[PDB]
Structure 1
Amino acid sequence: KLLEHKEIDGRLKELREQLKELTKQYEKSENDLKALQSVGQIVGEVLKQLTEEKFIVKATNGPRYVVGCRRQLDKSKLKPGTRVALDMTTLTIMRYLPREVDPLVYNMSHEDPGNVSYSEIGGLSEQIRELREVIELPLTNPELFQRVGIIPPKGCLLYGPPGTGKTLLARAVASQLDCNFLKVVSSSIVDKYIGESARLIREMFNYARDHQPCIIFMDEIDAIGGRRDREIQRTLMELLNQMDGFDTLHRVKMIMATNRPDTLDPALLRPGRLDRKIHIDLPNEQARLDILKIHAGPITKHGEIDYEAIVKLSDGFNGADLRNVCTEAGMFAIRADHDFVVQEDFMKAVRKVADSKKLESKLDYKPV
């Protein structure tokens, strides 16, 4: 008798479970239909309050209006520069939002910088120490700075030949410090809309101040930091003004990277904006050996590898050149169908990358 009872009871249980699921989609349908009745609200930044009731709000890029708080919102918190939402019928203020992220700035913060560590970067121990003293120590350990009274340097700029690792160094700093990191190619900040770039960089610095401890990195800064087309200079003025707005308390730091520091306008080169300069020169003999060891580490070689002879031959090479040496040795192995790599592959790769650098008619490069 228990089989029929179990059949009907299990059917009942399954039916009630399906009924709970069905009531769930019913509630979802009612919730989204109730949502459909909702009406959006116009966003906008605020301005001077004339009285305890009437305020001036600059509705987005549109015109500014004289409006009022609804009835219940705060009055002391509404100061010039608070993002507020406005009704589209009487334009009154309700639901004053914290601030805008400017989704581009969202992208430049939550962008993967890699798992690079200080170990993976080699040959710049002096530069790594300087940068960590300028950007890491003031952030992680401020009490030394405030008690001692030292104004921490606002930012540091990195210059050198292409492929020396400035960007790699910035990536390592981003990856190893548990913080909020901002990186954006300078060329991308420039926009064809009127004055959009100045508002872009203003909102980037506002986000950095909002999301301390925040770190903003500049690569190819000479795109906009170049010597005095019109919007470039207009946004450079905004850059100078905004980063002159760094208050001593702020846990925000600046890194600019470039390949032609001479083109940079001396305006940034002045003290008070960009004090500490770091030169990442072509890797030295021991530096080249260290970089080569780092890059050839994970490869599956067989037998002894004479890194010293390679470093003897690899004159004028940069870190990217050594990475190419490793890659071309790997490709000689892959063409020869060796499951491994030998010293001869590294030899051939060094010679090949040397012929490639022959093409590299690198013009002499000069600091700031």
Structure 2
Amino acid sequence: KLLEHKEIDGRLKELREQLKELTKQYEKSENDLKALQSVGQIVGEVLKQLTEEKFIVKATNGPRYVVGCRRQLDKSKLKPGTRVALDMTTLTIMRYLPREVDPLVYNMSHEDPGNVSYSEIGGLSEQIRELREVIELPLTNPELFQRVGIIPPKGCLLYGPPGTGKTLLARAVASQLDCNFLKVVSSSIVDKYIGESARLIREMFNYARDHQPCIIFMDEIDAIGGRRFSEGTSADREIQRTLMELLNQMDGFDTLHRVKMIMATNRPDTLDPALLRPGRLDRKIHIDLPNEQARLDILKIHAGPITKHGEIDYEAIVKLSDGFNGADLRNVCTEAGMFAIRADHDFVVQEDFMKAVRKVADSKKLESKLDYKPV
């Protein structure tokens, strides 16, 4: 005679699940009913402090006021250039916040997917190690730099033919540090106005001033950097002054603190030789079109998830190919598996690699000017 124990325990557990999943959502909605008594607070900024409790302020949508804090708001921490909160009705200061974002920063900052580490890439081991010495070190420890006593360097630029995985290398960086990446495509900065470009640059740079270990990556900088000639196009005046926004605020009065800039271009020639002086960017390091061992190693990276057999003629694929990126190897391996899927090879024959080398090497009829060598 013990079934009533289970016949009450199961009902107690199920009614407890009901009461928990219902009454807890009911307590959250009770907190929402309490939030129905919560007031929207005015955004604004201190203009200047006059007395111990009078504070000259200005609404960002309009008027100007002299008001006071609550009781414990740490008035000393209000310094002109801080973003504060005001009451709606009595208009008294309720809070100060860390500064704004203007969410164009958000929609390219936290859009970033983390990647695999540098195990995906290869044939740039010199670039891996040396660019590691110019990127990774002073946030691991900045004090071997201070054991010798020298200020750490600032930044670099990647160049060569387009698409070799300059940005994929930055992705391998974006998988390594995993800390504070701001990666901007760096051409949409001109909206339709004049100083809004500069203002967004300032907003990102004060975000980099607030947060310590920041990383900056800009791509296709030819649109935004450009070259200074005598003034022709009025739509290049803006690019010259935006470039001077870069010329100051990559050095500034205050030098940056752990704010690394990483750069990657398709042509570094058209950049102004005011930007080619070191200190700002330390060295322009080259990523090349691969060699035999480079093609072989990145190919064997791409030869991984393949239902192959004892047929893989590595040397014919690498030697019958005459300059092909990691993504060109994606093209060749992908379409070799496609030629397998052409007439449905559930396995992978090697002879389709020859067909893919045929197709892509014949497709290279279309691409000239294979270099832009800086300085």
Q: TM-score, normalised by structure 2?
A: 0.85
- For the residues of structure 2 that align with 1:272 and 1:283, how far apart are their CA atoms? 30
What's the CA shift for 1:313? 2.5
What's the CA shift for 1:127? 1.4
**Cα RMSD for the two superposed structures:** 3.1
Unaligned runs of 5+ in 1: none
Residues 11, 42 of structure 1: alpha-carbon distance in 2 compared, 3 angstrom cutoff: same
Higher helix share: 1
* Residue deviations 1:90-131 (CA, integer Å, cap 9, x gap): 543220012223333334333344433222211111211221
Which residue of structure 2 lines up, in the alignment, with residue 105 of structure 1?
Answer: 105
* Of 165-174 and 62-71, the range deviating more from structure 2: 62-71
Equivalent pair of 1:164/1:320 in contact (CA under 8 Å):
yes
- For the residues of structure 2 that align with 1:313 and 1:13, how far apart are their CA atoms? 70
Residues 64, 268 of structure 1: alpha-carbon distance in 2 compared, 3 angstrom cutoff: farther
Q: Secondary structure at the match of 2:44?
A: strand
Q: TM-score, normalised by structure 1?
A: 0.86
Residues 59, 226 of structure 1: alpha-carbon distance in 2 compared, 3 angstrom cutoff: farther
- For the residues of structure 1 that align with 2:151 and 2:5, how far apart are their CA atoms? 81
Residues 45, 288 of structure 1: alpha-carbon distance in 2 compared, 3 angstrom cutoff: farther
Residues 13, 345 of structure 1: alpha-carbon distance in 2 compared, 3 angstrom cutoff: closer
Equivalent pair of 1:154/1:246 in contact (CA under 8 Å):
no
Residues 50, 265 of structure 1: alpha-carbon distance in 2 compared, 3 angstrom cutoff: farther
What's the CA shift for 1:30? 4.0
Q: Secondary structure at the match of 2:136?
A: helix
Residues 58, 244 of structure 1: alpha-carbon distance in 2 compared, 3 angstrom cutoff: farther
* Of 340-349 and 314-323, the range deviating more from structure 2: 314-323
Task: Determine what percentage of the aligned residue pairs are the same residue.
Answer: 100
What's the CA shift for 1:171? 0.4
* Of 55-64 and 302-311, the range deviating more from structure 2: 55-64
Residues 217, 16 of structure 1: alpha-carbon distance in 2 compared, 3 angstrom cutoff: closer
What's the CA shift for 1:239? 2.9
1:293 aligns with 2:315: no
Residues 209-248 of structure 1: pairs in structure 2 closer than 5 A: 209-228=209-228, 229-245=236-252
Q: How many residues align?
A: 368
- For the residues of structure 2 that align with 1:280 and 1:8, how far apart are their CA atoms? 72
What's the CA shift for 1:22? 6.0
Which residue of structure 2 lines up, in the alignment, with residue 356 of structure 1?
Answer: 363
What's the CA shift for 1:4? 9.8
* Residue deviations 1:161-216 (CA, integer Å, cap 9, x gap): 11222111110011022422221211234433553332322222233333332212
Residues 13, 53 of structure 1: alpha-carbon distance in 2 compared, 3 angstrom cutoff: same
* Residue deviations 1:280-321 (CA, integer Å, cap 9, x gap): 122223222222222222222222322222222222333322
Residues 263, 21 of structure 1: alpha-carbon distance in 2 compared, 3 angstrom cutoff: same
What's the CA shift for 1:154? 1.6
Unaligned runs of 5+ in 2: 229-235
What's the CA shift for 1:325? 1.2
Residues 343, 36 of structure 1: alpha-carbon distance in 2 compared, 3 angstrom cutoff: same
Equivalent pair of 1:54/1:66 in contact (CA under 8 Å):
yes
Which residue of structure 1 lines up, in the alignment, with residue 231 of structure 2?
Answer: none
Residues 347, 106 of structure 1: alpha-carbon distance in 2 compared, 3 angstrom cutoff: same
Equivalent pair of 1:46/1:56 in contact (CA under 8 Å):
yes
Equivalent pair of 1:153/1:276 in contact (CA under 8 Å):
no
Which residue of structure 2 lines up, in the alignment, with residue 2 of structure 1?
Answer: 2
